[PDB]
Amino acid sequence: GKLPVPWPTLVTTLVQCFSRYPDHMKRHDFFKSAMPEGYVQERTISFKDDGKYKTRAVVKFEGDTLVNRIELKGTDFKEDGNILGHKLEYNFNSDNVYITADKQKNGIKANFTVRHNVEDGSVQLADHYQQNTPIGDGPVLLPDNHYLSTQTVLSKDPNEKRDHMVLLEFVTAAGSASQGEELFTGVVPILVELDGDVNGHKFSVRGEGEGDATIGKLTLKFISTT
């Protein structure tokens, strides 16, 4: 079957612990400090003049594998809009994601807008609100204000018959300190599992790959089931 939404609209939902934090910023890496116990990451993604995604994810280690388990609920979408109508370009341009501390949740938050190119030349906006909280009771690092700058390229496996997305992504923070930071000194296998429902259309996505936080690099292949 076919994914009922464009693959670019799921990129931000489908592991910021793999961002490269420079040495002078290691004291501000909340994402790694919450590991291995993990953190909960919740988002609302409002597509302008269209529907919304509500997501809740658990990001934690299972053995040496970093696992991202997500539940996605999409509502109020137009069957003929840019999302359900598959009208977006197959790409994903750069973002500066400003991270701020959420003191009383012992975590972080962020608000940023993603710009998806539409095939007719217009742009589809996706307003992200994000909240992260740690799962364990151990100490975590609460950061000063900073941001993560991203680069992403999407491609296809020419022999893969299933609906799928190959992703390569580099992320650096700008603008050990924790036991969890040490878990990311090398290449870490990644598994992502998303269960989705958009306007009643159910689907699931599984991705496999690896991340290298020393250079901020993510390589993943996602496959959808519908």
Side-chain angles (χ1 to χ4, degrees), residues 109-125:
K109 61 189 195 304
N111 170 225
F112 58 98
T113 302
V114 164
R115 284 171 81 84
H116 300 285
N117 286 358
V118 187
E119 290 174 333
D120 64 0
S122 61
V123 169
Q124 174 65 64
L125 300 191

PDB file of all heavy atoms in Angstrom, residues 109-125:
ATOM      1  N   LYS A 109      11.919  22.593  25.422  1.00  0.00           N
ATOM      2  CA  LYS A 109      10.825  22.836  24.493  1.00  0.00           C
ATOM      3  C   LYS A 109      11.372  23.569  23.275  1.00  0.00           C
ATOM      4  O   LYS A 109      12.495  24.079  23.283  1.00  0.00           O
ATOM      5  CB  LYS A 109       9.687  23.627  25.154  1.00  0.00           C
ATOM      6  CG  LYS A 109      10.084  25.001  25.666  1.00  0.00           C
ATOM      7  CD  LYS A 109       8.962  25.621  26.486  1.00  0.00           C
ATOM      8  CE  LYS A 109       9.176  27.115  26.686  1.00  0.00           C
ATOM      9  NZ  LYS A 109      10.497  27.410  27.315  1.00  0.00           N
ATOM     10  N   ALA A 110      10.561  23.616  22.217  1.00  0.00           N
ATOM     11  CA  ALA A 110      10.947  24.280  20.979  1.00  0.00           C
ATOM     12  C   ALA A 110       9.699  24.625  20.181  1.00  0.00           C
ATOM     13  O   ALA A 110       8.689  23.918  20.242  1.00  0.00           O
ATOM     14  CB  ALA A 110      11.884  23.410  20.131  1.00  0.00           C
ATOM     15  N   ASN A 111       9.785  25.716  19.424  1.00  0.00           N
ATOM     16  CA  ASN A 111       8.729  26.110  18.498  1.00  0.00           C
ATOM     17  C   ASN A 111       9.385  26.564  17.203  1.00  0.00           C
ATOM     18  O   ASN A 111      10.188  27.502  17.206  1.00  0.00           O
ATOM     19  CB  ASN A 111       7.853  27.217  19.094  1.00  0.00           C
ATOM     20  CG  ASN A 111       6.905  27.833  18.077  1.00  0.00           C
ATOM     21  OD1 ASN A 111       6.770  29.053  18.008  1.00  0.00           O
ATOM     22  ND2 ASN A 111       6.233  26.994  17.295  1.00  0.00           N
ATOM     23  N   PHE A 112       9.060  25.889  16.103  1.00  0.00           N
ATOM     24  CA  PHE A 112       9.683  26.178  14.817  1.00  0.00           C
ATOM     25  C   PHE A 112       8.710  25.822  13.703  1.00  0.00           C
ATOM     26  O   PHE A 112       7.814  24.994  13.876  1.00  0.00           O
ATOM     27  CB  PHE A 112      11.010  25.420  14.649  1.00  0.00           C
ATOM     28  CG  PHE A 112      10.884  23.917  14.751  1.00  0.00           C
ATOM     29  CD1 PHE A 112      10.813  23.137  13.611  1.00  0.00           C
ATOM     30  CD2 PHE A 112      10.867  23.289  15.985  1.00  0.00           C
ATOM     31  CE1 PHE A 112      10.703  21.760  13.696  1.00  0.00           C
ATOM     32  CE2 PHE A 112      10.761  21.908  16.081  1.00  0.00           C
ATOM     33  CZ  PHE A 112      10.678  21.143  14.935  1.00  0.00           C
ATOM     34  N   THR A 113       8.900  26.462  12.551  1.00  0.00           N
ATOM     35  CA  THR A 113       8.028  26.292  11.396  1.00  0.00           C
ATOM     36  C   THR A 113       8.820  25.700  10.241  1.00  0.00           C
ATOM     37  O   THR A 113       9.845  26.257   9.833  1.00  0.00           O
ATOM     38  CB  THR A 113       7.406  27.622  10.964  1.00  0.00           C
ATOM     39  OG1 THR A 113       6.666  28.191  12.053  1.00  0.00           O
ATOM     40  CG2 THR A 113       6.468  27.401   9.782  1.00  0.00           C
ATOM     41  N   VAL A 114       8.337  24.580   9.711  1.00  0.00           N
ATOM     42  CA  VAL A 114       8.954  23.906   8.576  1.00  0.00           C
ATOM     43  C   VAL A 114       8.256  24.370   7.304  1.00  0.00           C
ATOM     44  O   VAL A 114       7.029  24.521   7.280  1.00  0.00           O
ATOM     45  CB  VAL A 114       8.873  22.375   8.745  1.00  0.00           C
ATOM     46  CG1 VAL A 114       9.142  21.662   7.430  1.00  0.00           C
ATOM     47  CG2 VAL A 114       9.848  21.904   9.827  1.00  0.00           C
ATOM     48  N   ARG A 115       9.037  24.620   6.251  1.00  0.00           N
ATOM     49  CA  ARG A 115       8.525  25.066   4.957  1.00  0.00           C
ATOM     50  C   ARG A 115       8.651  23.931   3.944  1.00  0.00           C
ATOM     51  O   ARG A 115       9.759  23.617   3.494  1.00  0.00           O
ATOM     52  CB  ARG A 115       9.282  26.303   4.475  1.00  0.00           C
ATOM     53  CG  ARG A 115       8.887  27.591   5.168  1.00  0.00           C
ATOM     54  CD  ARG A 115       9.826  28.736   4.803  1.00  0.00           C
ATOM     55  NE  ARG A 115       9.499  29.352   3.518  1.00  0.00           N
ATOM     56  CZ  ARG A 115       8.581  30.302   3.357  1.00  0.00           C
ATOM     57  NH1 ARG A 115       7.886  30.738   4.400  1.00  0.00           N
ATOM     58  NH2 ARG A 115       8.355  30.814   2.153  1.00  0.00           N
ATOM     59  N   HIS A 116       7.522  23.329   3.574  1.00  0.00           N
ATOM     60  CA  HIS A 116       7.485  22.283   2.554  1.00  0.00           C
ATOM     61  C   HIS A 116       7.148  22.899   1.202  1.00  0.00           C
ATOM     62  O   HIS A 116       6.122  23.570   1.064  1.00  0.00           O
ATOM     63  CB  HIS A 116       6.442  21.213   2.887  1.00  0.00           C
ATOM     64  CG  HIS A 116       6.670  20.501   4.186  1.00  0.00           C
ATOM     65  ND1 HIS A 116       7.651  19.548   4.351  1.00  0.00           N
ATOM     66  CD2 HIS A 116       6.012  20.573   5.368  1.00  0.00           C
ATOM     67  CE1 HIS A 116       7.603  19.078   5.586  1.00  0.00           C
ATOM     68  NE2 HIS A 116       6.614  19.679   6.222  1.00  0.00           N
ATOM     69  N   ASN A 117       7.995  22.650   0.200  1.00  0.00           N
ATOM     70  CA  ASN A 117       7.711  23.113  -1.154  1.00  0.00           C
ATOM     71  C   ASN A 117       6.550  22.331  -1.754  1.00  0.00           C
ATOM     72  O   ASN A 117       6.511  21.098  -1.673  1.00  0.00           O
ATOM     73  CB  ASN A 117       8.943  22.965  -2.049  1.00  0.00           C
ATOM     74  CG  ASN A 117      10.013  23.996  -1.756  1.00  0.00           C
ATOM     75  OD1 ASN A 117       9.840  24.864  -0.907  1.00  0.00           O
ATOM     76  ND2 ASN A 117      11.129  23.907  -2.469  1.00  0.00           N
ATOM     77  N   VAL A 118       5.608  23.052  -2.366  1.00  0.00           N
ATOM     78  CA  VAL A 118       4.467  22.466  -3.061  1.00  0.00           C
ATOM     79  C   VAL A 118       4.788  22.409  -4.549  1.00  0.00           C
ATOM     80  O   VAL A 118       5.481  23.278  -5.090  1.00  0.00           O
ATOM     81  CB  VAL A 118       3.175  23.272  -2.789  1.00  0.00           C
ATOM     82  CG1 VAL A 118       1.954  22.569  -3.370  1.00  0.00           C
ATOM     83  CG2 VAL A 118       2.989  23.483  -1.291  1.00  0.00           C
ATOM     84  N   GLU A 119       4.270  21.379  -5.225  1.00  0.00           N
ATOM     85  CA  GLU A 119       4.617  21.151  -6.626  1.00  0.00           C
ATOM     86  C   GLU A 119       4.225  22.310  -7.536  1.00  0.00           C
ATOM     87  O   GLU A 119       4.785  22.434  -8.631  1.00  0.00           O
ATOM     88  CB  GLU A 119       3.966  19.859  -7.122  1.00  0.00           C
ATOM     89  CG  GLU A 119       4.567  18.596  -6.518  1.00  0.00           C
ATOM     90  CD  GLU A 119       3.814  17.339  -6.912  1.00  0.00           C
ATOM     91  OE1 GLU A 119       2.597  17.430  -7.194  1.00  0.00           O
ATOM     92  OE2 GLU A 119       4.439  16.256  -6.934  1.00  0.00           O
ATOM     93  N   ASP A 120       3.297  23.167  -7.116  1.00  0.00           N
ATOM     94  CA  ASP A 120       2.860  24.291  -7.934  1.00  0.00           C
ATOM     95  C   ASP A 120       3.632  25.576  -7.646  1.00  0.00           C
ATOM     96  O   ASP A 120       3.237  26.643  -8.131  1.00  0.00           O
ATOM     97  CB  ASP A 120       1.358  24.530  -7.749  1.00  0.00           C
ATOM     98  CG  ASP A 120       0.993  24.939  -6.330  1.00  0.00           C
ATOM     99  OD1 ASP A 120       1.894  25.039  -5.468  1.00  0.00           O
ATOM    100  OD2 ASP A 120      -0.208  25.161  -6.076  1.00  0.00           O
ATOM    101  N   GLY A 121       4.706  25.506  -6.864  1.00  0.00           N
ATOM    102  CA  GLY A 121       5.525  26.656  -6.563  1.00  0.00           C
ATOM    103  C   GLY A 121       5.244  27.313  -5.226  1.00  0.00           C
ATOM    104  O   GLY A 121       6.091  28.069  -4.736  1.00  0.00           O
ATOM    105  N   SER A 122       4.086  27.051  -4.624  1.00  0.00           N
ATOM    106  CA  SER A 122       3.783  27.626  -3.323  1.00  0.00           C
ATOM    107  C   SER A 122       4.533  26.867  -2.228  1.00  0.00           C
ATOM    108  O   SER A 122       5.322  25.953  -2.492  1.00  0.00           O
ATOM    109  CB  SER A 122       2.276  27.624  -3.081  1.00  0.00           C
ATOM    110  OG  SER A 122       1.752  26.310  -3.099  1.00  0.00           O
ATOM    111  N   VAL A 123       4.291  27.253  -0.975  1.00  0.00           N
ATOM    112  CA  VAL A 123       4.948  26.656   0.182  1.00  0.00           C
ATOM    113  C   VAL A 123       3.887  26.277   1.206  1.00  0.00           C
ATOM    114  O   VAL A 123       2.955  27.048   1.460  1.00  0.00           O
ATOM    115  CB  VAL A 123       5.988  27.617   0.803  1.00  0.00           C
ATOM    116  CG1 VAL A 123       6.460  27.103   2.156  1.00  0.00           C
ATOM    117  CG2 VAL A 123       7.175  27.801  -0.135  1.00  0.00           C
ATOM    118  N   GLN A 124       4.025  25.086   1.786  1.00  0.00           N
ATOM    119  CA  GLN A 124       3.129  24.599   2.827  1.00  0.00           C
ATOM    120  C   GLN A 124       3.844  24.686   4.173  1.00  0.00           C
ATOM    121  O   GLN A 124       4.881  24.045   4.370  1.00  0.00           O
ATOM    122  CB  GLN A 124       2.696  23.162   2.531  1.00  0.00           C
ATOM    123  CG  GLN A 124       1.872  22.508   3.622  1.00  0.00           C
ATOM    124  CD  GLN A 124       0.528  23.179   3.816  1.00  0.00           C
ATOM    125  OE1 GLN A 124      -0.318  23.172   2.921  1.00  0.00           O
ATOM    126  NE2 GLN A 124       0.322  23.760   4.992  1.00  0.00           N
ATOM    127  N   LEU A 125       3.292  25.474   5.090  1.00  0.00           N
ATOM    128  CA  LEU A 125       3.903  25.692   6.393  1.00  0.00           C
ATOM    129  C   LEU A 125       3.447  24.627   7.380  1.00  0.00           C
ATOM    130  O   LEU A 125       2.301  24.175   7.333  1.00  0.00           O
ATOM    131  CB  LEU A 125       3.543  27.079   6.926  1.00  0.00           C
ATOM    132  CG  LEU A 125       3.981  28.258   6.058  1.00  0.00           C
ATOM    133  CD1 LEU A 125       3.811  29.544   6.827  1.00  0.00           C
ATOM    134  CD2 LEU A 125       5.425  28.086   5.628  1.00  0.00           C
TER     135      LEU A 125
END
